[PDB]
Amino acid sequence: MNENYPAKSAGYNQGDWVASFNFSKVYVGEELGDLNVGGGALPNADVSIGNDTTLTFDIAYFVSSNIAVDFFVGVPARAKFQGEKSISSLGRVSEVDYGPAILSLQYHYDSFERLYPYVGVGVGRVLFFDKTDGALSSFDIKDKWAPAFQVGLRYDLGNSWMLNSDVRYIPFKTDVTGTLGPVPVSTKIEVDPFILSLGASYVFKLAAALE
């Protein structure tokens, strides 16, 4: 004889697994200038109509109320690398990662289901950077991860699935972007490019532990 226990949509303790999915988007003044020399903010070389949404996935593990685990996974994109003066190094360090992996912790101060911000801090690295081709042997490192932070948003769109967003500032290399046709007058230049992602998330319970 055995007893049954048909549970329903309820809470969950440490060990929760929430599937986060959202697309990233690059925010930068391209219309102003893109790979062109000139000191004029005139209309030209307008961006081509289309979509630049980068489907990105992330794993959110709920273990603590004060702090939660977060993992980023998705295709690469224009962004910083290490952000620090090189003291000791030598090589090329290319960016040919296909399936990278980032690990960071998330912190919130809502303690409830409502439209509140979200903080995230941790480090990121590449996964299986080593390729399968006979080109250059001994070209892989044990583990190479760097520091990084990010701030997202948490909003409730429905009941089961919710809405999640991600915001991260991106540095701009020294360079000018404009169009031909110089003018006597002067205009302000406030671009400040950055990366922002938006999507939804769903909490799930793997219900699998061994201790």
From Swiss-Prot:
The keyword Lyase does not apply. Transmembrane segments: none annotated. GO terms for cellular component: cell outer membrane. Disulfide bonds: none annotated. Gene3D superfamilies: 2.40.160.20. GO terms for biological process: transmembrane transport. Belongs to the OmpW/AlkL family. This is Outer membrane protein AlkL. The gene is alkL.
